[PDB]
Amino acid sequence: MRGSAHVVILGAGTGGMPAAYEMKEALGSGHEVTLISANDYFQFVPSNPWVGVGWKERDDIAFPIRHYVERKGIHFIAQSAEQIDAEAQNITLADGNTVHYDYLMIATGPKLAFENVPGSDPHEGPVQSICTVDHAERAFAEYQALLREPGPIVIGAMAGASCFGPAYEYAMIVASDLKKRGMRDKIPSFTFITSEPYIGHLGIQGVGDSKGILTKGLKEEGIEAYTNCKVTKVEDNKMYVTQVDEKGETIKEMVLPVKFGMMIPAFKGVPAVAGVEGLCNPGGFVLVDEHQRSKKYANIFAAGIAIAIPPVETTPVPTGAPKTGYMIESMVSAAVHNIKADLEGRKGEQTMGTWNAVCFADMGDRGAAFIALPQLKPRKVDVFAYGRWVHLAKVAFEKYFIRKMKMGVSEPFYEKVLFKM
Template identity: 60%
Template sequence: MAHIVIMGAGLGGMPAAYELRALLPPEHQVTVVNPSDTFQFTPSNPWVAVGWRERSVVTLPIAPMLERKGIRFVASGASSIDPAANRVTLENGQSLEYDYLVITTGPKLSFDEVPGAGPHGGHTHSICTVGHAEMFWAEYQKFLEAPGPIVVGAMPGASCFGPAYEFAFILDADLRRRKLRHKVPMTYVTAEPYIGHLGLGGVGDSKSMLESELRGHDIKWITSARTTKVEPGTLFTTQLDDQGKVVKEHEVPFKLAMMLPAFKGVDAVAGVADLCNPRGFVLIDEHQRSRKYRNIFSAGVCVAIPPVEATPVPSGAPKTGYMIETMVTAIAHNIADELAGRPATAKGTWNAICLADMGDTGAAFVALPQIPPRNVNWFKKGKWVHYAKIAFEKYFMRKMKTGNSDPIYEKYVLKALGIVRLADRG
């Protein structure tokens, strides 16, 4: 009997548990460990932050969902990993021996890299967790009584730019509905070298389209922004040119700010010798396996992927839902094959597919592969994306409730986007 331990119960960890349980014979044990006892559907956090969703709609209790599938759950974070002993020590003092370890922890939010940043003792908000989104919503309700300037964007080293764009447009839409938009100057501040870069070197005509949308919604922007500190009511950022030379020093006023942070690997993972790169992201081969430890696999935001290109202000490459889905599927099949005496051959993909809500419309982009040159390089805007994002939320939450191991992107999203592309061509 083999014991597979999965660290993390998010968009990667939960599907990994379901897929492994579906593939493996019953004598093999699957255990999931996670600091929280609640699954969070992270893509809905921008809606939570403006009161369009409540916690109860975008979260689920983990234990009953896993237990129905015969998967053990321990509600505790990991404090350390001993790969020589094949052991994970948890923060609750418990130790778990493993035959295979699957790391899907997500990132550590590195607010401390910019003094004054972050929702815990700092002056900016985040939508990286449901709790952070709720903190923004609490302050936003007070803000609505006496509006002022808003700053939205992403800090140096960030790699997840899509939600920042989403949130800027969602805030714009919400303020227009409340007939308060005229009282709220908005500025988008980003480490990207240009609008629509997205950490991907642009996708299709994302640059011109997103610039047009920002202009149309009266949102100013600062790109190649090296944000250096945040003080109450003021964000300090240095704008650089393409050669990395200073163009302008900005002091951007705000009454409310949401700035996505840079990511790092979580401490328990980053502390393992030869497992990670200097920022704590797991170094993996084409089969999602650690380059150093052959029985450790990893998927999602916590894996090391090089930037698409060098930028004046550091910016990372995003790990989108489709990419994470294929990584998880590859891990499940590779572990199942090894346990059956077959070599591990399954591979994930570095393709990027994203549905980004914009309040009352939306934008979809497809980059296949993620790193140029690409076979598919497509970006499209339309109200249908807004509704597709809502449908995706509902389907994914149902998938988690039922323990369905079907891949969503392969089965539904790619087909739907293919139909849209064909319709565009007439």
């Protein structure tokens, strides 16, 4: 309302959850902050691959949201938004109720675009997913079924995927788990299929020696790997794969039987956001300026996977660059600061800063991590590392982030750098 702005945060995930706390903290008692999300629980998504192999359970990585945000003065609506009218500034919820906003922060993350590959939906065939805890649990269930009746394994990433790390991570831990169960030698064939132009491209043109180390890693585990691949369909428990050359021409077609499978899908924007006229690019990603503000609607901001970031390269098979946790947090901080500024006359000048990608993958006793910035080479930092410190860091961070999501966030978030001072 006038003089008492109502700020709505859409999506309670890695960007959205902290956004709600930061917003309330920044705006104080004289402004209404409402968090709206499809699920009533928060999930720590980097843990999903471990859930998918049964190394973690849902209870460890997920918790109900209401009490934690409400104790902080935040209103929580555990309902999916179906429609957004940017003109009337109304959001229509699943149950038909409508919510008005003065400012909207879109943090809706990815739509998992299984529709890009007929039969690839986890409910349609043997190709599973580890992007959400629901799917990772389903994946593990199917993993157990492969255990009872061994058959070929196919893990990897679809055309248009932008999140490659987890495919490598899942493939490695499955292998690990298969050995630990003394079941590894029961598998007819274990294949890695990716839209990357080469192993360890990772959607970022490689980082450190990601190419050499991931290649060696896959061979070490007896996983046969194909790059420049797109899946055209999953059908009759078979994956139809087309592999191309540098110029897009076909160099082969394969038909791979699948007993157990997991392909990272392409991400698009969620329908209710992509549905807003003139808001998004053709993929359904919100077009924002450097301040995280919609280019079309001055009172709409966005952060997280939901925003559009222009491609910097064009690969034989369509691929995307990942949007990772540290950058997402910077987007969130910028949005909160700039909205607050709006509510006070100023024009917030804060931006998300330098593009970067930071990923940590835990293999059990040790992990791999990378840091790349900025997006194009030659980079200022281009590091791929492997060791125990990586495992320790992942374990530590999951514990930290989850605690933070329960206890509240002021907050210039990452002072993980107090381990220096």
